[PDB]
Amino acid sequence: GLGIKRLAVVRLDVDDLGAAFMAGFSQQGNGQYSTLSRSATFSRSMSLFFKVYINQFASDKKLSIIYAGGDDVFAIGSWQDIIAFTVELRENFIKWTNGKLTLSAGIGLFADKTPISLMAHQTGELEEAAKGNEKDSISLFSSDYTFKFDRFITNVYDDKLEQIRYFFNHQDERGKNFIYKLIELLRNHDRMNMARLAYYLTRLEELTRETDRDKFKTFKNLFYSWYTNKNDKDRKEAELALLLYIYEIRK
Amino acid sequence: NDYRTFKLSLLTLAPIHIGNGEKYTSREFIYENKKFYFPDMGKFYNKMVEKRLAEKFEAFLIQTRPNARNNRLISFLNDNRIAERSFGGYSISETGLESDKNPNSAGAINEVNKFIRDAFGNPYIPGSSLKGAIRTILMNTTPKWNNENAVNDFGRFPKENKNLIPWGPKKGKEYDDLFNAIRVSDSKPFDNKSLILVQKWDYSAKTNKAKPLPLYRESISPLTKIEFEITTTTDEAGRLIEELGKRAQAFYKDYKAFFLSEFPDDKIQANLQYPIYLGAGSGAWTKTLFKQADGILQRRYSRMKTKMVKKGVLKLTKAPLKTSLVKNHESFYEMGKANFMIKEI
Amino acid sequence: TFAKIKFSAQIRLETGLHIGGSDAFAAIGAINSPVIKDPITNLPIIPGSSLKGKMRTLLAKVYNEKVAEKPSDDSDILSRLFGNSKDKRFKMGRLIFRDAFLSNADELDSLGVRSYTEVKFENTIDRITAEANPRQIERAIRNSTFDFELIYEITDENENQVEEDFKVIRDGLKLLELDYLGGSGSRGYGKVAFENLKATTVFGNYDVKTLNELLTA
Amino acid sequence: TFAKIKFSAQIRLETGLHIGGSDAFAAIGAINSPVIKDPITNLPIIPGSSLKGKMRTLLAKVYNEKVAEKPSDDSDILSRLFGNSKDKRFKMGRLIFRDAFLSNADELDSLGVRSYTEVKFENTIDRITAEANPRQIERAIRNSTFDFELIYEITDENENQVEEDFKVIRDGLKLLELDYLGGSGSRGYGKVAFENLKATTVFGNYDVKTLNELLT
Amino acid sequence: SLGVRSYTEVKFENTIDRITAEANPRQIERAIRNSTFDFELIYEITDENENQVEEDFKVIRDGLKLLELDYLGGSGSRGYGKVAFENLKATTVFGNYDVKTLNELLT
Amino acid sequence: ILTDENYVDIAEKAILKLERNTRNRKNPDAFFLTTSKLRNLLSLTSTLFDESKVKEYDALLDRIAYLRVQFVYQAGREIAVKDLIEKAQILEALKEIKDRETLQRFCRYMEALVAYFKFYG
Amino acid sequence: ILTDENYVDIAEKAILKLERNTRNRKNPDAFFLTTSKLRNLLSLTSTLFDESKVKEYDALLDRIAYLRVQFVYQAGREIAVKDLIEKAQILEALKEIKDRETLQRFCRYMEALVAYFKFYG
RNA sequence: ACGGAAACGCUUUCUAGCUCGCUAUAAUUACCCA
Known part of the structure; x- marks a missing residue:
């Protein structure tokens, strides 16, 4: 029962595909490399990626690639598998296209029995908000949880989320309530909430079982480290990582 | 049940005055006859x-x-x-002997300190006064609770630690609290016909005289049996309440060899039960761990009325002699001597 | 079926109590530890939480075999009366306490009472240097009485469990005549007398003629 | 014919009422359980949904046959009164519980009322280690009266179950006079009472005068 | 000018099962109390319109009599309603037809 | 007179106005008045301040009427208390007690006097 | 003076500027100021701030007058709280309130002081 | 002769469950001033 009962939809897109076909190759050199053979080879390479090889990246997962190819991909599915499938698709498209040709997903979380026109349009609005975030972005779930693929995959989905899972699934005192109040303080966020969180974490540090306290101490110093980092890029990661964790542990 | 009750019956040899904070002034009473009227x-x-x-x-x-x-x-x-x-208000009759001054000048009492009262108009003795008198016996007769309980010179160094007795929640630890497990309840409130308003009388050594003081506290008439309860909840506390009848004598033996000696025997009373020293007049050697407060108490008095050397004055009063509860002339009591007996119920 | 009965006890005070409250604008030289009182009548209340969570500990040292260490660990002779919040079928109460409002606000003025509370002065004699530390704790006076209503629920989950529970309600309501009822406790402040334990039904139909004999025992 | 039967009443409190609002993070010394409040006047408010839910589960303890698994698994007498989400004829049926809005907001102020919500300080004593976790939880004044009304609408489909439903509604008001109506009710909060019950037709034509006799 | 911070309140609410007795919380955004809204209602008079307008106005004003007794809004059986009407004037625009007998049917 | 928004400042510069020992440079600017008599002034008004929270003005105005005579008597005992009731206008403010909400204000003025005494030496 | 961008930072670098305990090397570099002598000052302003939302300012200007009484009185009792109101300028944050949003700003300043006191030991 | 006509984002849902304002504490100490 470890999940919320939702289904996600990702509409990926290669950013600047038209800029990759009009100019494409004339950036390296003196206009001597945009030729016919390289253009046809790149075109067959991209169709070979986005039509054949999406089935390999989505082989075990519980999703359904509705439409795929050219640049655009529109895939419904169960939500953990959708998010991991976007992660695998980006982590194989930068292995494919050498870090060039950034792609931009936008994921939307939906309840059951919602129509797949009210779903597809909200995911498309998420996706164009991601494309307008920067050249590359993934817009998880909402028009404010916009990240980069360079930062969502490493920091949010594998660094922060595994640290939160490694901390929380070892202990048996702090439950869902501490995580909910943490997201509330991460979402409200004036400067005074940094002091309120400094009081809250220090109050809960000595409320624990005093044997395994330094588990909570190395968690709370780390959480206060990525609340008050003052870069605006390490706070929304913590909020979305706790959203994904509360989604994962919802009964 | 774990709650082993008790029954303390207390007895007034010397008069006892307990708190109340406020006091009447020189112009807050009437004296028409042997009754003082306090309106x-x-x-x-x-x-x-x-x-x-x-x-x-x-x-x-x-x-x-x-x-x-x-x-x-x-x-x-x-x-x-x-x-x-x-x-x-209330109107209490006179002690009859606190007016050392000439007859018919008499009645010129000045500042009377009220007895503690509940709101109906009767007095009583609080359970917290008896409990604080019990705590000094249990702290001065348990020899593990006298040695290290001192200042260690934290501030200017006068202050005690106040942690040497099981006290508090104390995270992780099981709830000890010895003195939570000693539950002294209040007394049954008696009537105003046992209050006499003794005057304080200081009887010093090194100038063998009994110079009186202008402080005329109300008090308790002697030979009044007072009800009390001590309903414990831990057998560790049951040991201390059972050994009260011996620790009171041990405290009085380490008192009388220490402070009541160098003062003559005629001013001292007998016991007749087990001895206890209730508040307001007994002095700072019944309110303290006196065997360690000999060099710390006299540092505080660097004012116009310093203690004479160490163990400076013995406090007496003047009550009607009711027996013979004394052993001397002119009715000099000890102002805080009382005697209790304990029994399980 | 579904009934609901009601205990109309009267808490008479004996050397009355002080249920604390915290005030940030009290005084300088007046009350710093006040009794909790009603805001519009200014009579002291014995609130229902300090009755319920006192009877919970009294019967939790008694009606438990495993040492509890927490609520949601009681042996379900309690937790079907007081409710857990981690057991599935025992989340709701089945006991509804009440605030005990002061009844005799006029049988107290019959006596010479000029304030329904009394302020006690209570120093702390430092056992070295003999010095004091006064305070003024407020407390409700001796001959008070408080209308104590307690309500017991009855559904069709009590197959044979109704008349068992009055060996839990009378056990709590004559173990509170042993304990202090919140307050300083070990300095007085507690002893009480649940007069007139007189159960009666207020919803549904139920026979309490067999019930009023194990209350006057 | 079609009609509406408004039930004017007053909810006189006793043992003052706590109905929680936000679970938001209380400030560092502030009130930990704030009561729900009208955002204009900042007075207390009993919402209509507490009055519907508690009355719902009180009549469900009386007027069922089996123990229900959800508010849609109720009987025919409660689904027509409150509303069944599953049935084809019991959606939106027979009762609008309007709010309750502090009628004597100045009769309290003619007595000595500082503010309209007291803050009861409270704690809990741990069993092992006997510590204390305090809480400053808020509740309305002991002698407030809130403004209760129910637009019991007739539907021109029952026409003999009219008086049948008021033996249920006055029973629900008796049960609310016995149960607690929101908050920590096993710790003696809530305790409403219903002053001046009066049913009155506001639209159509019905014989409510032969019906206030049961209200009395 | 009455003094308020944001135009919508957030009523917290819950759902309690009758088996587990377990909560299930909601947050309902709500337009706050004593707001006013500019309501207006064109009623067009035409040729086929004539001779029945007297029972288009003991129905319109019998309809606005109903909205002050039913809820006008979602979740209206739990409060969330009680809409009142005020300044209910019936003017006329683009026409030659007096309204000053209708204006005392309403006000 | 004293309203809510001045009684602290009125009580502040009163203690700046109180006389000191011109002689005796041992903790200099030591007042002629001591903390004990000021607390014995405040203990007259503390019970009234509590009864102005619980009770009404009508069962209380005789206690207020006696409090003026209490301040009169405490003035006639010591010269510094005779002056403190003149630097801080105490008897001028006791004439104007028309409400609970003025009696509580006068008791806060007394507590402000004691607080600003304790803050200064 | 304290405004809406700095009143948490003022509290942080006013707790940090406070002096630490010299002796007592069990939990060393700790504060003279016990937690109770600061919670019994936030106790005033928390019950103010919960009342500032309900009540108008010009019915809550006696409680703010009592604030400067109590801060001065708690300062004159022990040197630690005197050092606190001299380091974190609480008296000069109390002459300047005069309206509701500044009163809530001062209450949140006191809350930030308590929060950063609990944070650093 | 308005890609228009008709159409309530609506029904059901308790901010609820559990929790002692509690632990320690004598209104007391010193002896005088003119």
């Missing part, structure tokens, strides 16, 4: 203001006229012939 002075003012006489009462209060006979508000009513005495 509710707001209602005294509310009756007396009808005559437009209160402006005269504004002159009488700042009037430092001599010959104290005409200073104590009896002469105000014997002068302006106010003749009711129908006011509120």
Whole structure:
């Protein structure tokens, strides 16, 4: 029962595909490399990626690639598998296209029995908000949880989320309530909430079982480290990582 | 059940005065006969203001006229012939011997400290007063609770640690709290016909005399048996309450060899039960761990009335001799000597 | 079926109590530890939480075999009366306490009472340097009485469990005549007398003629 | 014919009422359980949904046959009164519980009322280690009266179950006079009472005068 | 000018099962109390319109009599309603037809 | 007179106005008045301040009427208390007690006097 | 003076500027100021701030007058709280309130002081 | 002769469950001033 009962939809897109076909190759050199053979080879390479090889990246997962190819991909599915499938698709498209040709997903979380026109349009609005975030972005779930693929995959989905899972699934005192109040303080966020969180974490540090306290101490110093980092890029990661964790542990 | 109850019956050899904080002044009582009348002075003012006489009462209060006979508000009513005495408050009869001064000057008492009372108009003895008197016995007779319980010079160094007794929640630890497990309840409230208003009498060494003090606290008449309960909840506390009848004697033996000696035997009383020293008059050697507070208490008094050397004065009073509960002439009591007996119920 | 009965006890005070409250604008030289009182009548209340969570500990040292260490660990002779919040079928109460409002606000004025509370002065004699530390704790006076209503629920989950529970309600309501009822406790402040334990039904139909004999025992 | 039967009443409190609002993070010394409040006047408010839910589960303890698994698994007498989400004829049926809005907001102020919500300080004593976790939880004044009304609408489909439903509604008001109506009710909060019950037709034509006799 | 911070309140609410007795919380955004809204209602008079307008106005004003007794809004059986009407004037625009007999049917 | 928004400042510069020992440079600017008599002034008004929270003005105005005579008597005992009631206008403010909400204000003025005494030496 | 961008930072670098305990090397570099002597000052302003939302300012200007009484009185009792109101300028944050949003700003300043006191030991 | 006509984002849902304002504490100490 470890999940919320939702289904996600990702509409990926290669950013600047038209800029990759009009100019494409004339950036390296003196206009001597945009030729016919390289253009046809790149075109067959991209169709070979986005039509054949999406089935390999989505082989075990519980999703359904509705439409795929050219640049655009529109895939419904169960939500953990959708998010991991976007992660695998980006982590194989930068292995494919050498870090060039950034792609931009936008994921939307939906309840059951919602129509797949009210779903597809909200995911498309998420996706164009991601494309307008920067050249590359993934817009998880909402028009404010916009990240980069360079930062969502490493920091949010594998660094922060595994640290939160490694901390929380070892202990048996702090439950869902501490995580909910943490997201509330991460979402409200004036400067005074940094002091309120400094009081809250220090109050809960000595409320624990005093044997395994330094588990909570190395968690709370780390959480206060990525609340008050003052870069605006390490706070929304913590909020979305706790959203994904509360989604994962919802009964 | 774990709650092993008790029954303490206490006995007044010397008069006992307990708290109440407030005190009447030189112009807050009436003395028409052997009764002192203590009225509710707001209602005294509310009756007396009808005559437009209160402006005269504004002159009488700042009037430092001599010959104290005409200073104590009896002469105000014997002068302006106010003749009711129908006011509120309580009226207690005299001790009869706290007026060392000449007959008919008598009644010139000055500042009387009230006894503690509950709101119906009766007095009682609080359970917290007996519990704080019990705690000094249990702290001075348990020899593990005298040695290291001192300042260690944290501030200017006078202060105690106050942690050497099981105290508090204390995270992780099981709830100890020995003195939570000693639950002294209040006394059954008696009536105002056992209060006599003794005067303080200081009897010093090195000038063998009994110079009185102008502090006339109300007190308890001697030979009054007072009910009490001590309903414990831990057998560790049951040990201390069972050994009260021996630790009180041990405390009195380490007291009388230490402070009551160098003061003569005629001023001392007998015991007749197990001895205890209830509040307000017994001195700072019944309120303290005295075997470590000999060099710390006298540091505080660097003022106009320093203690004479160490163990400076013995406090006596004057009550009617009821027996013979004394062993001497002129009725010098000890002001705080009491004697209890304990039994399980 | 579904009934609901009601205990109309009267808490008479004996050397009355002080259920604390915290005030940030009290005084300088007056009350710093006040009794909790009603805001519009200014009579002291014995609130229902300090009755319920006192009877919970009294019967939790008694009606448990495993040492509890927490609520949601009681042996379900309690937790079907007081409710857990981690057991599935025992989340709701089945006991509804009440605030005990002061009844005799006029049988107290019959006696010479000029304030329904009394302020006690209570120093702390430092056992070295003999010095004091006064305070003024407020407390409700001796001959008070408080209308104590307690309500017991009855559904068709009590197959044979109704008349068992009055060996839990009378056990709590004559173990509170042993304990202090919140307050300083070990300095007095507690002893009480649940007069007139007189159960009666207020919803549904139920026979309490067999019930009023194990209350006067 | 079609009609509406408004039930004017007053909810006189006793043992003052706590109905929680936000679970938001209380400030560092502030009130930990704030009561729900009208955002204009900042007075207390009993919402209509507490009055519907508690009355719903009180009549469900009386007027069922089996123990229900959800508010849609109720009987025919409660689904027509409150509303069944599953049935084809019991959606939106027979009762609008309007709010309750502090009628004597100045009769309290004619007595000595500082503010309209007291803050009861409270704690809990741990069993092992006997510590204390305090809480400053808020509740309305002991003698407030809130403004209760129910637009019991007739539907021109029952026409003999009219008086049948008021033996249920006055029973629900008796049960609310016995149960607690929101908050920590096993710790003696809530305790409503219903002053001046009066049913009155506001639209159509019905014989409510032969019907206030049961209200009395 | 009455003094308020944001135009919508957030009523917290819950759902309690009758088996587990377990909560299930909601947050309902709500337009706050004593707001006013500019309501207006064109009623067009035409040729076929004539001779029945007298029972288009003991129905319109019998309809606005109903909205002050039913809820006008979602979740209206739990409060969330009680809409009142005020300044209910019936003017006329683009026409030659007096309204000053209708204006005392309403006000 | 004293309203809510001045009684602290009125009580502040009163203690700046109180006389000191011109002689005796041992903790200099030591006042002629000591903390004990000021607490014995405040203990007259503390019970009234509590009864102005619980009770009404009408069962209380006789206690207020006696409190003026209490301050009169405490003035006539010591010269510094005779002056403190003149630097801080105490008897001027006791004439104007028309409400609970003025009696509580006068008791806060007394507590402000004690607080600003304790803050200064 | 304290405004809406700095009143948490003022509290942080006013707790940090406070002096630490010299002795007592069990939990060393700790504060003289016990937690109770600061919670019994936030106790005033928390019950103010919960009342500032309900009540108008010009019915809550006696409680703010009592604030400067109590801060001065708690300062004159022990040197630690005197050092606190001299380091974190609480008296000069109390002359300047005069309206509701500044009163809530001062209450949140006191809360930030308590929060950063609990944070650093 | 308005890609228009008709159409309530609506029904059901308790901010609820559990929790002692509690632990320690003598209104007391010193002896005088003119």
